[PDB]
Ligand SMILES: NC(=O)C1=CN([C@@H]2O[C@H](COP(=O)(O)OP(=O)(O)OC[C@H]3O[C@@H](n4cnc5c(N)ncnc54)[C@H](OP(=O)(O)O)[C@@H]3O)[C@@H](O)[C@H]2O)C=CC1
């Protein structure tokens with residue numbers, strides 16, 4: 001008559017002061033966290049973007065995770081982003097933690113082919129980082145002189161990005177608390193290379209049908225077990241989950 | 247300082263007697279329930295099947311949902327299934343509910359092109375139903391004489407299946423409590439045609455990377471809101487969710 005199953009139910013209302021402890025980074029070491037939203041049937045997009053599906057809670061969560069991060073890493077696909085916005089209180093919180101007032105943005109591109117004309121370069125407090133390959137880093141540095149710091153992230157193939165090198169290059173610059181929000185190609189590479197430490201996933205209570213892509217894309221296939229650290233909900237039936245690599 | 251967020255936690259251990267009430271069908275009317283499993287990053291398969299990812303709880307849940315159903319509807323893709331197995335106690339439970347001892351199997355095929363040589367026809371207590379189009383129903387009836395009951399499920403196009411007609415044809419035969427377990431093409435059609443009443447989804451705590459398909463496939467795009475009826479968990483960090491159409 002016994003089963004391994006237990007009913008979950010809401011046991012505690014969270015104040016905005018208790019949220020940071022549920023999502024804090026470790027005290028030490030580098031930590032790469034992803035934060036994505038998807039539908040129940042695994043779809044990442046509605047009309048080409050993720051925004052349509054966001055829950056009453058998602059803005060507390062998405063804004064908190066940006067506030068906690070040293071750097072937000074984004075793929076060049078989804079940039080096409082502006083400078084991350086921090087409000088007054090967010091800046092104060094960051095300072096009290098000894099971080100910069102606003103997190104750095106880091107754009108991953110294998111080819112380095114970003115035009116000087118982009119909002120990631122224009123509407124922003126801080127020169128973004130461009131993470132790219134050894135093969136193209138010098139040319140890219142020259143082309144983006146003044147607009148971005150360009151960093152070579154290659155492993156044994158100077159024509160590709162090694163995602164473990166990428167994470168160590170950020171940590172070498174004091175950016176060890178890393179957040180990524182997209183896109184699916186980038187996330188797929190972190191998952192394929194087994195460098196993703198934690199996935200925060202908002203499960204939106206919709207089905208969207210078969211057209212949408214998943215939150216990850218690409219040829220990778222892995223089977224990486226994660227531990228469920230927490231599940232939050234709201235009155236709208238969204239689940240805000242946090243899973244950390246076992 | 248207040249947020250819409252609430253922490254979920256386990257509040258009640260479920261006995262196998264309490265599970266049926268969490269998953270019961272309505273008293274009246276037809277009800278189409280889906281039961282699927284997917285990874286955290288929205289992948290439906292590991293090495294081409296769903297079985298590798300199943301949780302300690304999934305066998306209580308998958309077996310219960312089969313036990314409760316009048317008919318299990320499956321697409322011809324994933325059949326390539328045998329007769330659903332019911333143990334002694336499952337048969338007793340069904341009888342006490344006034345149902346057949348074993349649920350019917352119903353195979354959906356647009357072309358009707360199933361060979362007489364299949365385990366769905368061979369290793370089974372009960373002739374399965376074949377749900378197909380008006381255009382091909384008579385030929386199909388003759389070819390499968392003795393092995394299956396063939397039912398025309400077309401709407402205004404005699405060359406296609408109308409999924410609402412499909413559900414009413416089952417209900418007309420006393421099979422109003424319907425379960426589907428696959429595959430993604432079929433599920434995508436139920437979602438696209440807005441005839442899916444409830445989705446029971448097991449969220450497995452793995453990431454699998456970008457190669458896998460979603461639990462639904464096909465060109466459909468919808469935005470159908472569902473209410474979260476419950477979330478169960480186990481010690482392995484699986485979530486067993488039940489969402490019902492709002
Ligand atoms: N559901 C959700 O939460 C989210 C949805 N989205 C969505 O992301 C979509 C667009 O994303 P998409 O362009 O497909 O994916 P990506 O943002 O990840 O970027 C694809 C491009 O980014 C670069 N890139 C990514 N990753 C890597 C790597 N490891 N090494 C080198 N280069 C890399 C490549 O740049 P290059 O070609 O220059 O070499 C590549 O062409 C949008 O539809 C947006 O809505 C995005 C994030 C969150």
Ligand SMILES: NC(=O)C1=CN([C@@H]2O[C@H](COP(=O)(O)OP(=O)(O)OC[C@H]3O[C@@H](n4cnc5c(N)ncnc54)[C@H](OP(=O)(O)O)[C@@H]3O)[C@@H](O)[C@H]2O)C=CC1
Nearest residue numbers: 282283290295296321322323324356357428429431432435
């Ligand atoms: N993660 C999970 O829980 C699950 C995973 N799986 C998987 O399903 C996969 C195979 O499934 P797949 O073949 O792609 O999909 P389907 O089982 O849904 O079937 C595709 C075929 O089934 C028929 N079919 C489906 N739906 C309809 C409809 N509304 N009208 C008419 N005909 C229809 C068609 O038959 P025809 O061509 O003859 O006309 C079609 O070619 C496997 O990989 C299996 O592991 C499946 C279910 C659960």
